[PDB]
Amino acid sequence: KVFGRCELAAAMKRHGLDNYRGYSLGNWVCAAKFESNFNTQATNRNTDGSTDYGILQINSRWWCNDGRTPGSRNLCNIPCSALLSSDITASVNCAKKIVSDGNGMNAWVAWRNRCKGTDVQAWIRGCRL
Numbered sequence: 053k054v055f056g057r058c059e060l061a062a063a064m065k066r067h068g069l070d071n072y073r074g075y076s077l078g079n080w081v082c083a084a085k086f087e088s089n090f091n092t093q094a095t096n097r098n099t100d101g102s103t104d105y106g107i108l109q110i111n112s113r114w115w116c117n118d119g120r121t122p123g124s125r126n127l128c129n130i131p132c133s134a135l136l137s138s139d140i141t142a143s144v145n146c147a148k149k150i151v152s153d154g155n156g157m158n159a160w161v162a163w164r165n166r167c168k169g170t171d172v173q174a175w176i177r178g179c180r181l
């Protein structure tokens with residue numbers, strides 16, 4: 053499912069993401085924009101063999117199991133395919149574990165390079181929240 057900008061912001065807001073660990077809702081919307089282009093079914097292979105999954109491109113190296121990342125972790129205790137569903141519940145819950153790992157939203161390379169320090173609030177303006 054390819055989310056609308058305000059549709060994704062409302063879904064992230066309903067699942068408790070806005071101001072989670074001090075990151076306002078605009079940061080999460082901006083991150084999903086540049087990680088997956090609002091597409092829950094996005095996947096991208098990495099050089100080390102792991103794969104990013106879903107609306108926030110959560111990596112199978114640490115957070116989910118896809119059966120093909122040898123010596124990896126499954127800290128969110130889910131199959132990576134669950135991160136591709138039209139329901140973003142699993143992606144949001146796993147993201148809350150990632151952002152609480154000590155490095156904040158810097159775990160998402162797209163957010164650090166394309167959202168951090170910008171006017172992230174602009175990604176939720178015009179939305180009826």
Ligand SMILES: CC(=O)N[C@@H]1[C@@H](O)[C@H](O)[C@@H](CO)O[C@@H]1O
Nearest residue numbers: 098104109110111159160161162
């Ligand atoms: C939080 C998370 O899983 N981030 C991943 C990370 O593995 C990496 O920096 C990159 C790989 O292309 O994509 C995503 O940002």
Ligand SMILES: [Cl-]
Nearest residue numbers: 076077078173
């Ligand atoms: Cl914001």
Ligand SMILES: [Cl-]
Nearest residue numbers: 119120121122
């Ligand atoms: Cl694996």
Ligand SMILES: [Cl-]
Nearest residue numbers: 063138139140
């Ligand atoms: Cl949803």
Ligand SMILES: [Cl-]
Nearest residue numbers: 073155156157
């Ligand atoms: Cl932080």
Ligand code: NA
Nearest residue numbers: 112116124125
């Ligand atoms: Na894994």
